[PDB]
Amino acid sequence: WTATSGSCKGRCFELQEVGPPDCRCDNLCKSYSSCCHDFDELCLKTARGWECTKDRCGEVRNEENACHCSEDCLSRGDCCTNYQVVCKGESHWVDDDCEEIKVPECPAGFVRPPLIIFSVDGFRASYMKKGSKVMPNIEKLRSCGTHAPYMRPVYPTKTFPNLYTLATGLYPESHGIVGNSMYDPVFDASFHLRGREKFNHRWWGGQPLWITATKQGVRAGTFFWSVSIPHERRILTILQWLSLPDNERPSVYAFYSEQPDFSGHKYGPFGPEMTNPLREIDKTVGQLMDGLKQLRLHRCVNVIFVGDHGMEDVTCDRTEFLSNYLTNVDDITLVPGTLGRIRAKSINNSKYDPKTIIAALTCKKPDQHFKPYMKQHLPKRLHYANNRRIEDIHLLVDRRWHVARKPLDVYKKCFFQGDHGFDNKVNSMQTVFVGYGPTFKYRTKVPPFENIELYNVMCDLLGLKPAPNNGTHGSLNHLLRTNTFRPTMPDEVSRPNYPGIMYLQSEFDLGCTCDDKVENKLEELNKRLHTKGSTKERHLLYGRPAVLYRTSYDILYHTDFESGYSEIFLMPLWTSYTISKQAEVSSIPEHLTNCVRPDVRVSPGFSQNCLAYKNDKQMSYGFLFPPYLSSSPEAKYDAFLVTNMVPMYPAFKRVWAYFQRVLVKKYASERNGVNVISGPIFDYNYDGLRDTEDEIKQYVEGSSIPVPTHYYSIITSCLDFTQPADKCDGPLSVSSFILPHRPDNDESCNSSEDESKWVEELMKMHTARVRDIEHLTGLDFYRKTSRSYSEILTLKTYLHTYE
């Protein structure tokens, strides 16, 4: 109910929100059907347009105008943005040569450079270069300011998840907005595009920048704008707010443009009709910067030009129908489009089974344009599982396609040529970032980064303390002239033991055998040194990983590799080794195929045993340091230590063996040596975080040996590849993966073929950031380099995309 009898007189775009049933005058009253009767007349004026013409110059003030050209308008903060250019012989901001902003130049009474977020829906990264001829204002921002070639959105690459991620620094699984459409089973409520449920506070998690600001005494303009408010009016409203007295004036503002998303959907990402939407956006940027100039704020304000996601070519005829795969089509609810989420249509149907749904969807057609997953099996880099609003069954749809339930859903609901939502590593989904102002660097290009990092930086720009978030604070310091935040490495929580030889062979009853009884001060003094860590500088290049939680573990040294061995999990947390470009691959000798050897540094009670793998018909074992890369026949025996062994399904050993036998050598060849750190991951509750001992859901049968959900590797070398990985003087280069440890290769449709045709493609899909592995393991890598900690944080957030 709205008693619309009240007035907007003197309240146009008020900053506080008056509660019902009094009428509103804010930038969202239209969306609520709650504006006062006079909102349009007073607050949405349009008379005479948005620009001064010659003959309006020093006119008599006429309150009915949209904006003014009268002499008092700089006083009232309501001149047309082009006022000074037409009436006072000033030039447009874009026509001025750009000049470094070494220090903020703010008018008296400004405590801090204001922040203006200029957000553009569906602004694909390549528009910066491809449309640069028709966007001179945006091109000046970009080339004079700080820019990335692209910014990575979050999955799914839809609007609500990405704008709320921008605002909170959180993954959608933590902020709760996991799609533009959602069902919450606990609430028993649906979130939609059309309607009033989306306004309910319970949907929105974390703490967006406007709440962070407000709680720490920094005032914010209102971020959201009703679609019917024209872009010019949005710009003039922001400019008017910027002339409020010091005690009332917000310090952070947002503008939002529906374009180029709106036209990109109808015309496709590069349709000829896309030029005008881009000209129009530029013109708006131009109005803003002209407006800031008249206010003498153009060298005081920090401006962020930022997109939510890109746009891909997608038409009706590229739709896959679930009704071509499932017999029980009407038993399911599908959330459709550029991603698929599936649940049971009725909760009272116990003849519903995810396993048979998945199996009917799995490599069923030669050219299949979507791949089904249980949500916990999705690539960890998507972080898209830990929320009840995310359905257990998920379809990753190929770029350029839709998935729908039945054909009648498409033609009774082509209308469109563009869409988005796909995997956030897809090139067409990338978006833009430009930062311009006293706090950003001058003419600086920074590497691509993820939009989850931005909340931290916007907090820094405003002197705020960020709420806990998924950004890595420090990783974007190289974007900033000043206001850097100077992080310190976390403290190690557990210190390792350094076991010596403590146990005789015969104390072990592990059911393991090895043909190793074949055996000198020459080569025995030598090997005692290796077990004490004489070659550790070779294999442990960036310090030992720090264990950041309370546990009991041993460092074990070997000729070819070093490991941190957990007495809790009966296996290493990490194994480190360096493969030089000269290193040669060997095979496992015939007599050593089944060889496993007790480790006399580690008690029998804290070792695995071969009996367990014998009795477990589903489970085999692999090794973390690969025997193929051993440096000598004698060194090879170290690779067969029971303390280098890990449980692996046979199906996964196909993947792991090809990685260790073929790909490590190939990376070392290409990168001029590589350092590898490999290990197990336990994330049974799919929250992206290390599981504690009492959360383990699966053991090798009849043992206390826990079964990893994933295996990771981090592969580091020198960024200047003319330098070997073990003698690198400068920046480092990294790629990582987090491979799911599954009992079949159903994910890989070509898996019956040779590993050379499918394994590297799997690994590429499961590419990961070192930071992702840190959360999953409780480990902290790169503790001892000669690089700055900020540079190290950036390296740790890097994702190698292969696109």
Ligand X SMILES: *[C@@H]1O[C@H](CO)[C@@H](O[C@@H]2O[C@H](CO)[C@@H](O[C@@H]3O[C@H](CO[C@H]4O[C@H](CO[C@H]5O[C@H](CO)[C@@H](O)[C@H](O)[C@@H]5O)[C@@H](O)[C@H](O[C@H]5O[C@H](CO)[C@@H](O)[C@H](O)[C@@H]5O[C@H]5O[C@H](CO)[C@@H](O)[C@H](O)[C@@H]5O)[C@@H]4O)[C@@H](O)[C@H](O[C@H]4O[C@H](CO)[C@@H](O)[C@H](O)[C@@H]4O[C@H]4O[C@H](CO)[C@@H](O)[C@H](O)[C@@H]4O)[C@@H]3O)[C@H](O)[C@H]2NC(C)=O)[C@H](O)[C@H]1NC(C)=O
Ligand Y SMILES: O=C(/C=C/c1ccc(OC(F)(F)F)cc1)N1CC[C@@H]2CN(C(=O)N3CCc4[nH]nnc4C3)C[C@@H]2CC1
- The annotation status of 159 as a binding-site residue, yes or no, is yes
Rg (CA), the chain: 30
User: Cα-flanking dihedrals φ and ψ of residue 145, to 5°?
Assistant: -100, -145
**Selected binder of Ca ion within 368, 685, 704, 801 (CB under 5 A):** 685
| 227 touching Ca ion, by CB under 5 A | no
**Nearest in space to 338 (alpha carbons), one of 308, 358, 318:** 318
What is the set of active-site residues?
Answer: 159
CB burial of residue 187 (10 Å; 0-12, 13-18, 19+): middle
**Selected binder of Ca ion within 419, 460, 554, 683 (CB under 5 A):** 683
Does the bond joining 372 to the residue before it have cis omega, within 30 degrees of 0? no
From the CB of 120, what's the least distance to ligand Y, in Å? 10
Whole-Å CA distances, 332 to 187, 225, 318: 20, 36, 22
| 451 touching Zn ion, by CB under 5 A | no
What would the DSSP string read from start to end of 635-663?
A: HHHHHTBTTSEEEE-HHHHHHHHHIIIII
Structure tokens at 473: 């604070």
- The annotation status of 551 as a binding-site residue, yes or no, is no
Rounded-to-integer distance, Cα 101 and Cα 255, Å: 23
Rounded-to-integer distance, Cα 767 and Cα 790, Å: 22
Amino acid found at 733: S
| For ligand X, the closer CB: 164 or 436 | 164
**Selected binder of ligand Y within 223, 270, 433, 737 (CB under 6 A):** 223
Are 106 and 300 a contacting pair, CB within 8 Å? yes
Are 306 and 433 a contacting pair, CB within 8 Å? yes
| 261 touching ligand Y, by CB under 6 A | yes
Q: Which of residues 484-543 bind ligand Y (CB under 6 A)?
A: none
- The annotation status of 689 as a binding-site residue, yes or no, is yes
**Selected binder of ligand X within 77, 104, 149, 205 (CB under 6 A):** 205
State the pairing for strand pair 767-768/732-740.
antiparallel
From the CB of 690, what's the least distance to Ca ion, in Å? 6
Q: Using CB atoms, what's the residue nearest to ligand Y? A: 256
**Selected binder of ligand Y within 199, 224, 498, 802 (CB under 6 A):** 224
**Selected binder of ligand Y within 60, 108, 186, 193 (CB under 6 A):** 193
Rounded-to-integer distance, Cα 368 and Cα 324, Å: 11
Reduced to 3 states, what is the DSSP secondary structure of residue 19? coil
Phi-psi bin for 185: left (phi > 0), alpha (psi -120 to 50), beta?
alpha
What would the DSSP string read from start to end of 311-333?
A: -EE--TTSEEEGGGT-S-GGGEE
- The annotation status of 491 as a binding-site residue, yes or no, is no
| 206 touching ligand X, by CB under 6 A | yes
| For ligand X, the closer CB: 455 or 577 | 455
- The annotation status of 683 as a binding-site residue, yes or no, is yes
Find tokens 């557990």 and name the residue: 494
Rounded-to-integer distance, Cα 790 and Cα 487, Å: 8
Reduced to 3 states, what is the DSSP secondary structure of residue 755? helix
Question: Of ligand X, ligand Y, Zn ion, none, which one does residue 447 interact with (CB within 5 to 8 Å by kind)?
Answer: none
| 775 touching ligand X, by CB under 6 A | yes
Rounded-to-integer distance, Cα 292 and Cα 354, Å: 56
State the pairing for strand pair 402-404/319-321.
parallel
Rounded-to-integer distance, Cα 361 and Cα 356, Å: 9
From the CB of 34, what's the least distance to ligand X, in Å? 26
| 638 touching Zn ion, by CB under 5 A | no
| For ligand Y, the closer CB: 256 or 325 | 256
| 380 touching ligand X, by CB under 6 A | no
Question: Of Zn ion, Ca ion, ligand Y, none, which one does residue 209 interact with (CB within 5 to 8 Å by kind)?
Answer: ligand Y
Among the listed ranges 12-20, 115-123, 125-133, 438-446, the one in contact with ligand Y (CB under 6 A) is: 115-123
Are 250 and 219 a contacting pair, CB within 8 Å? yes
**Nearest in space to 118 (alpha carbons), one of 40, 2, 231, 240:** 231
Reduced to 3 states, what is the DSSP secondary structure of residue 534? coil
| 747 touching Ca ion, by CB under 5 A | no
Structure tokens at 189: 């409520």
Contact characters 447-486, ligand X, x per CB under 6 A: --------------------xxxx----------------
Question: Of ligand X, Zn ion, Ca ion, none, which one does residue 387 interact with (CB within 5 to 8 Å by kind)?
Answer: ligand X
Are 531 and 557 a contacting pair, CB within 8 Å? yes
Contact characters 686-725, Ca ion, x per CB under 5 A: -x-x-x----------------------------------
Structure tokens at 636: 């090879």
- The annotation status of 775 as a binding-site residue, yes or no, is no
| For ligand X, the closer CB: 174 or 735 | 174
- The annotation status of 309 as a binding-site residue, yes or no, is yes
Among the listed ranges 14-22, 40-48, 123-131, 158-166, the one in contact with ligand Y (CB under 6 A) is: 158-166
**Selected binder of ligand X within 6, 122, 172, 176 (CB under 6 A):** 176
What would the DSSP string read from start to end of 565-602?
A: EETTTTEEEEEEEEE-TT----PPPGGGTT--B--TTS
| 131 touching ligand X, by CB under 6 A | no
| For Zn ion, the closer CB: 140 or 158 | 158
Among the listed ranges 201-209, 248-256, 529-537, 658-666, the one in contact with ligand X (CB under 6 A) is: 201-209
What would the DSSP string read from start to end of 213-275?
A: HHHTT--B------TTS-HHHHHHHHHHHTTS-TTT--SEEEEEEEEEHHHHHHH-TT-GGGH
- The annotation status of 200 as a binding-site residue, yes or no, is no
Contact characters 578-607, ligand X, x per CB under 6 A: ------------------------------
Residues that bind Ca ion (CB under 5 A): 683, 685, 687, 689, 691
Residues that bind ligand X (CB under 6 A): 170-171, 173-176, 205-207, 383, 386-387, 467-470, 688-689, 775
Please state the residue numbers annotated as binding site for Ca(2+): 683, 685, 687, 689, 691
Please state the residue numbers annotated as binding site for 1-tetradecanoyl-sn-glycerol 3-phosphate: 159, 180, 261, 420
Please state the residue numbers annotated as binding site: 121, 159, 180, 261, 265, 308-309, 420, 683, 685, 687, 689, 691
Residues that bind ligand Y (CB under 6 A): 117, 119, 121, 159, 163, 166-167, 180, 193, 209, 223-225, 227, 254, 256, 261, 306
